[PDB]
Amino acid sequence: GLKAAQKTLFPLRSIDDVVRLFAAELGREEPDLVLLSLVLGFVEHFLAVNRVIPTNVPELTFQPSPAPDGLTYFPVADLSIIAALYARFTAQIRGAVDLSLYPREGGVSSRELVKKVSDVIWNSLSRSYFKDRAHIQSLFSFITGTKLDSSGVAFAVVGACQALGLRDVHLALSEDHAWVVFGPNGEQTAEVTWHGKGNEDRRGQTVNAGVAERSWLYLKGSYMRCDRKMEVAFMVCAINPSIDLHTDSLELLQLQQKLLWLLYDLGHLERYPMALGNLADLEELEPTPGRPDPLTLYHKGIASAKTYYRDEHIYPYMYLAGYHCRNRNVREALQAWADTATVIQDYNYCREDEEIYKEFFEVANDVIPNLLKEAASLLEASALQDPECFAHLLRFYDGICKWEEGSPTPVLHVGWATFLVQSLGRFEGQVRQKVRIVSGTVAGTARGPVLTFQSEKMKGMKELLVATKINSSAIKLQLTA
Numbered sequence: 001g002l003k004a005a006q007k008t009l010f011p012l013r014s015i016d017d018v019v020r021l022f023a024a025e026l027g028r029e030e031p032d033l034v035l036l037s038l039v040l041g042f043v044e045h046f047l048a049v050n051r052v053i054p055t056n057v058p059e060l061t062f063q064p065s066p067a068p069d070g071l072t073y074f075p076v077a078d079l080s081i082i083a084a085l086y087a088r089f090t091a092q093i094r095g096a097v098d099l100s101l102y103p104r105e106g107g108v109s110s111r112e113l114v115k116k117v118s119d120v121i122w123n124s125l126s127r128s129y130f131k132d133r134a135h136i137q138s139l140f141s142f143i144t145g146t147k148l149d150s151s152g153v154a155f156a157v158v159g160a161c162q163a164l165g166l167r168d169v170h171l172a173l174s175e176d177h178a179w180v181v182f183g184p185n186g187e188q189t190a191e192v193t194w195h196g197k198g199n200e201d202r203r204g205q206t207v208n209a210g211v212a213e214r215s216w217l218y219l220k221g222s223y224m225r226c227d228r229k230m231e232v233a234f235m236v237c238a239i240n241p242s243i244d245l246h247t248d249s250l251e252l253l254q255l256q257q258k259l260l261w262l263l264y265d266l267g268h269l270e271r272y273p274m275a276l277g278n279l280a281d282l283e284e285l286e287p288t289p290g291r292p293d294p295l296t297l298y299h300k301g302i303a304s305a306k307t308y309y310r311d312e313h314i315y316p317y318m319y320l321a322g323y324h325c326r327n328r329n330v331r332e333a334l335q336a337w338a339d340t341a342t343v344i345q346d347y348n349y350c351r352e353d354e355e356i357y358k359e360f361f362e363v364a365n366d367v368i369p370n371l372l373k374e375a376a377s378l379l380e381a382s383a384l385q386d387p388e389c390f391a392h393l394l395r396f397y398d399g400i401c402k403w404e405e406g407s408p409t410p411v412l413h414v415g416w417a418t419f420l421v422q423s424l425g426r427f428e429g430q431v432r433q434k435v436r437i438v439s440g441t442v443a444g445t446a447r448g449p450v451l452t453f454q455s456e457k458m459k460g461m462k463e464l465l466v467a468t469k470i471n472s473s474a475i476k477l478q479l480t481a
């Protein structure tokens with residue numbers, strides 16, 4: 001229910017009023033996910049979904065204020081609008097789940113209870129809508145339009161469980177999928193949403209098969225297990241400032257940035273690597289005085305992945321590579337993509353890993369070839385003269401090759417082979433042979449660049465990659481075999 005401590009902070013007539021609600025809620029023993037998701041969805045609706053201020057709607061008012069280069073109008077989150085939306089969600093869940101039928105073994109939710117709550121959210125959704133549509137992530141979207149994206153359904157099941165008073169059900173997250181964790185120690189797992197485009201319905205099952213398989217989608221079991229504060233962080237990361245393909249809401253960017261600093265300062269981003277990369281992206285767009293630099297924040301994201309998730313996360317390095325690409329730091333961008341491939345090498349490419357395959361396919365066959373092409377234009381009146389860039393390029397391919405080893409389906413095909421030959425060819429013979437590809441002579445210690453290949457394919461290509469005249473057919477045949 002909504003208490004006085006919550007209601008007295010309403011109405012929210014500004015960005016700072018919304019931040020105050022979140023600061024107050026984060027200080028409570030159990031932060032209300034439903035209320036916080038509704039507010040974000042309400043303000044996102046008028047700031048990005050339908051910016052045209054309604055004429056025939058009374059009660060709904062907008063707050064003018066000075067915009068940094070005339071006026072800007074903020075959707076006033078009235079207590080009556082939000083409280084009615086909140087009451088409608090609560091009434092729906094409580095009315096569909098009869099908790100007397102479920103034996104709560106000392107504050108522990110059964111699989112049967114978690115599956116019923118999942119079935120309630122699932123059966124409420126519209127029969128037909130575009131799944132990759134923007135702004136269908138929040139509880140506002142679930143209540144006003146019965147539309148939720150993939151991870152939105154997972155968050156809604158958690159929100160619904162909290163409303164029923166089930167403190168043991170939590171959000172579980174990988175870098176591309178979401179499920180719930182529950183039980184006496186949070187070691188019980190259940191699928192609650194779909195994943196991919198026509199990849200069946202595994203809803204109600206454990207994530208064991210996905211973890212045992214070594215797919216990137218289940219991160220070999222080193223996935224995030226959210227507490228309530230991390231679920232608030234997820235919801236803030238889930239804010240979509242996109243108005244259209246090329247424009248953003250300056251208010252939603254400013255709101256997500258201020259909310260991410262709030263979460264950061266309380267230490268709730270310490271175990272959320274991708275939130276730190278998101279904050280760093282926001283800081284580069286609009287630096288806030290007294291705060292650390294985007295580079296410091298990207299490295300804090302990598303440090304979190306290393307400390308709490310045994311360095312099995314891809315996107316913290318991808319965020320840093322993104323920064324360096326935008327700023328045209330070729331060496332530092334190639335280094336961060338090679339570090340991404342060093343992580344993926346200990347995974348096996350499975351059916352539902354298309355999201356990360358598409359990411360690697362694009363860097364290896366579009367982004368890197370585009371970078372080295374632009375770098376070659378700059379040489380005609382530098383990074384291509386640096387043997388360290390060449391070693392990063394080879395370590396990157398080494399990771400992709402090793403990733404393919406032990407995989408049920410191939411990674412590298414004829415399409416990759418072409419861009420490897422072209423990318424190798426962008427470095428002169430003298431620069432390429434400065435790299436020492438060694439296996440190591442002695443193991444341990446006693447009281448030009450050097451590179452070691454972890455993959456069979458790059459190892460068998462050793463001499464070809466470094467030869468003055470590139471044997472295209474042989475490099476293509478070995479990469480695709």
Ligand SMILES: COC(=O)N[C@H]1CCC[C@@H]1[C@](CN1CCC1)(c1cccc(F)c1)C1CCN(CC2CN(c3ccc(S(=O)(=O)C4CN(C(=O)CCCN5CCCCC5)C4)cc3)C2)CC1
Pocket residue numbers: 137150151173174175176177178234237238274275278315318319321322323325326355359362363367
């Ligand atoms: C922090 O935010 C979140 O956690 N968001 C969550 C909340 C709601 C759900 C959302 C989401 C959504 N997914 C579902 C499909 C997308 C998610 C997370 C966990 C579980 C889950 F189910 C869903 C995530 C969204 C954020 N992504 C992370 C980002 C993708 N990524 C990224 C970074 C770099 C590259 S890159 O390949 O390096 C590339 C090339 N490069 C360049 O800059 C080129 C050179 C420059 N040049 C080019 C043009 C000329 C000038 C500049 C960028 C690619 C992707 C960062 C993860 C999934």
